[PDB]
Design a protein around this ligand. Structure first.
Ligand SMILES: O=c1[nH]c(=O)n(COCCO)cc1Cc1ccccc1
Ligand SMILES: O=c1[nH]c(=O)n(COCCO)cc1Cc1ccccc1
Lengths: 285, 285
C-alpha cells in the first residue's frame, strides 16, 4: 500500500487536493483510483495526454480528470495514470504531495511511479535514453536539500535499483533505441544553472561552462533536467518504487541548441513512452 | 529600453525562445511586441487570460500567442501583455529568461512588469493585498541564492521603491480594499516549506510550525508565495522596474485552510487586477 510520511494526515476529517480539483469528501477516491498500478509523470500536458492515448492503444482497450483546474492534467487508462507536472522542483513537488496522498486515500497497492521527460545529454549521442540510477544536484552530489521551515534537511536521491535494472533489460529488446543507466543532474535554472550562454543572464565564460560540463561527466552525470532529485527523494521517503526515464535531445559538450529535423525530434520525444509501454505490457503479461 | 545582462546574446545569429514557441527569425518580434508597456505575470493561465479580457474592457477597446506550446500562455491587448508562469521559482525563471529576451528583441521601452497572485497571509486579514517591498527566502533573508554552474551567487530582492509607492497610493482611493506594503516570503515547497500539516510529507509538529510563522511575522513577513525572490532578483539585474501584488486568501496564524463563500473567494482573487487596472489607466490617462 502507498504510505505518506505525515502523522497528522489521517487524523484529519477531510483532505482537499487543492491543485488537482479532488478531495476525500467530494470524491470516492478508492472507487476512482483503487486499481491504479502505473503512474507516469512528465512536464508537458500534451505529451502526457498523448501518452495516455498511446497506452490505451497499446493495451488494446479518455478525459482530463483535473479538467476543473489549470494546474495539472491527469488521464487514466486502466491501471495506468498519467499526470503532467509542469517545470521545476517546486511544481513537481506540489503535484507529488497531492498525488502520493491520492494514492494513499484511494488505497492503491503494488504501485510503480515513473517520470518520463526530455533532457540535455553529456557525452552521449542525441536521442539516448537515460534510466537514472541516482539523481544528483548542481554540485554533482547525490542528495536533495529540502527546505523545511527555516531548516535545510538532506534527503537521499537513489531510484529503485531493481526497477532501473528491469527497465534496462526491457530497453535491450528494442531496435534503434540507445539506452544507458547513469546519473542525472537536476538544476533549479534551465539557463545559467545548466551552463547555457543564451539566457537573459549569463555571468560566466565559455571556458567555465565547458569545464563545468566536463567535470559533470567525470562525476558520472549523463543527462540534465529539472525534476529528478525531488522526485527520487519524495518517492523514496514514502516508500514508492520510482524510476526516471529521459531522452536526451542534444549533447551539451558539443551543442547548446537542438539541431534536428522535426521528424527526428518527434521520434526522440517518443522514446521514453516506447520503453514504458514495453515495461507495462511485460508486468501485465 | 529593456536590457539583458548577457554579453553572448547579441553575438548570436538567431535566438529561439523554446518555451514560448517564438524566435527572432521565425517571428518579427518588434512588430508583435514593440508597443508593450505593461507586463503582467501570474501562475494560472485561466486567470491570466481572464485578466487580459478584463483589461481589454477596462481600457475600452484575444488569443494565446503561445498556442503552439503547452509550457506557458500569453495574451496581448494594446500595451498590455499577460503571461502565465506556472508554479515555483524554476518555472517562473525560464519564463523570465525568455520574456526579458523577447522584450529586448522587440525593442520595448518604458516597460513595467508586475507579478499578480494569491498568497498565504501572516497576521493580516484574509483578502489583504500585499505590495511587496522586499522579497525574502525561507530563512527570512532579503536575498535570492542563484545557482550558476556549481556556484552560489546571492542577489538583491528589492522591488522598485517608486513603483510600490505608486501602487500603494493607487489603492487608497479604492473602498473596501485592505492594502499594505511589506515583506513577502517565497518558498520552494508549498507544504513543508510553508509549515503546512497536510502534505504527503510532514517533518515538524503543529507547535513548531506555529512558532516558525510567528518568527516569520517578527522578521517582517506578511505573506507567503512561491515566485517573488527570483522575480525580484532577475528583473533587478536587468534594470527592469518590477512589482509584486498578491492578495491573501487566509491568515496562516489562524487557519491552515481557506474558509470563504464562493463569492468572497472570487472577489479576493480579483483584487490584484482591480489595483493593476487603476494603475494602468492612471499611466495612460
Ligand atoms: O537541455 C535540456 N535541459 C532540461 O532540463 N530539459 C528538461 O526540460 C526542462 C524544460 O524544457 C530538456 C533539455 C533539452 C532541451 C534543450 C534545449 C531546448 C529545449 C529542450
Ligand atoms: O498559502 C498559499 N501559499 C502560496 O504559496 N500561494 C501561492 O501559490 C501557490 C499555488 O497555489 C497561495 C496560497 C493561498 C492558498 C492556500 C491554500 C490552498 C491554496 C492556496
Amino acid at each position: 500500500f502507498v504510505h505518506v510520511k505525515n502523522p497528522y494526515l489521517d487524523l484529519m476529517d477531510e483532505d482537499i487536493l487543492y491543485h488537482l480539483d479532488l478531495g476525500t469528501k467530494t470524491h470516492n477516491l478508492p472507487a476512482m483510483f483503487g486499481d491504479v498500478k502505473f503512474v507516469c509523470v512528465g512536464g508537458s500536458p500534451n505529451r502526457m495526454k498523448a501518452f495516455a492515448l498511446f497506452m490505451h492503444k497499446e493495451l488494446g482497450f479518455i478525459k482530463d480528470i483535473c479538467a476543473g483546474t489549470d494546474r495539472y492534467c491527469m488521464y487514466k487508462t486502466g491501471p495506468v495514470l498519467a499526470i503532467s507536472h509542469g517545470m521545476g522542483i517546486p511544481s513537481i513537488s506540489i503535484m507529488l504531495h497531492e498525488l502520493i496522498k491520492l494514492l494513499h486515500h484511494a488505497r492503491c497497492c503494488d504501485v510503480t511511479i515513473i517520470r518520463i521527460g526530455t533532457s540535455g545529454g553529456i557525452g552521449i549521442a542525441p536521442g539516448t535514453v537515460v534510466i537514472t540510477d541516482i539523481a544528483v544536484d548542481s554540485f554533482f552530489k547525490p542528495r536533495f536539500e529540502q527546505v523545511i521551515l527555516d531548516n535545510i534537511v538532506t534527503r537521499s536521491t537513489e531510484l529503485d535499483k531493481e526497477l532501473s535494472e528491469e527497465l534496462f533489460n526491457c530497453s535491450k529488446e528494442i531496435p534503434n533505441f540507445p539506452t544507458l543507466v547513469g546519473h542525472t543532474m537536476c538544476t533549479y535554472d534551465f539557463y545559467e544553472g545548466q551552463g547555457r550562454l543564451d539566457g537573459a543572464l549569463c555571468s560566466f565564460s565559455r571556458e567555465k561552462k565547458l569545464d563545468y560540463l566536463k567535470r559533470a561527466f567525470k562525476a558520472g552525470v549523463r543527462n540534465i533536467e529539472m525534476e529528478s532529485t525531488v522526485f527520487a527523494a519524495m518517492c523514496g521517503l514514502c516508500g514508492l518504487k520510482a524510476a526516471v526515464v529521459c531522452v536526451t535531445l542534444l549533447d551539451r559538450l558539443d551543442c547548446d541548441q537542438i539541431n534536428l529535423p522535426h521528424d527526428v525530434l518527434v521520434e526522440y520525444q517518443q522514446r521514453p513512452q516506447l520503453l514504458i509501454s514495453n515495461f507495462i505490457r511485460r508486468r501485465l503479461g
